Symmetry: C3
Subunit: 90 residues, 3 copies
C-alpha cells in the first residue's frame, strides 16, 4: 500500500574511506541486549547493520515469501480440485 | 509475541516549523547503497523517513496482509467445496 | 533470502547504567506523528524503543506467523480432501 518501493539500507557491502572497514558490522550481543545510553554516540557500522537488517528482511517478506505463498495456496487448491475431478470422471 | 500495537514514526505529511519543508524525504540512492561514514552526518528528513517506511511496511504486513490472506484462504476452500458438492448432488 | 539471523534490539529490559530510567520508552504520539525536527536532541530511550518494536515484530512474523499459516493450510487441505474422498467412496 505505501507508495514507495522498499529500499534496502546499505544494500551493497564495501569499504568506507573514513573507516577503511566494511560498511556493516555486527553489534556485540551485549549492546543488542542492552542498547544505547545518554552520552553514547553510535558507530556507523552498527547503525548501517541494524538498518540493513530491518529493511532487507521486510523486503524479503514482501517480495519473496508472499508471492511464493499465494502461488502455493492457489496451486494446492487447483491440485485438490483436479484430483476430485479425476475421481468424479469415473 | 509483541505486546503493544505498532505505531508509525512521523506519520503525518506536513512542513516542519523549523524547516518549512516536508517532514520526510527519500535519501539519495548513493547514500542508500553505502550508508553513513565517520565524517558524514545524518539529516532529520532521512532519519524520519527510514523509520516511517519501516513502521508503515510493518503495519501493511501485520494488520493488512495476513487478515486478507486468511479470508482468501477460507473463501477458496468454501468455493471449492460448493463446486464439488453441486456435482455430488447431481 | 537474507543471511542475517535477525535479533531483537535492546532485548533486555533494565534501567540504564547511568540513568535510573528504563532503557526503552514509547515516544509521545506528538513526536510520532511529526518526527525529529531541526535542533532536537534524540534520546536513546526512543531509539531503543522503536528498534525493539521493529525487530520483535519482524522476527515474530518470520518465525511464528508463517509456520502457523502453513500448518493451517495443510490441515485444511487434508481435511477437505478427506471429506470428498469419503463421500465419493460412499
Amino acid at each position: 500500500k505505501p507508495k514507495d518501493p522498499i529500499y534496502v539500507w546499505a544494500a551493497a557491502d564495501v569499504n568506507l574511506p573514513g573507516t577503511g572497514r566494511p560498511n556493516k558490522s555486527k553489534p556485540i550481543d551485549d549492546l543488542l541486549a542492552k542498547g544505547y545510553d545518554k552520552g553514547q554516540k553510535p558507530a556507523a557500522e552498527e547503525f548501517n547493520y541494524i538498518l540493513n537488517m530491518s529493511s532487507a528482511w521486510v523486503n524479503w517478506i514482501v517480495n519473496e515469501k508472499f508471492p511464493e505463498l499465494e502461488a502455493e495456496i492457489a496451486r494446492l487448491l487447483a491440485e485438490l480440485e483436479n484430483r476430485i475431478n479425476q475421481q468424479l470422471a469415473v
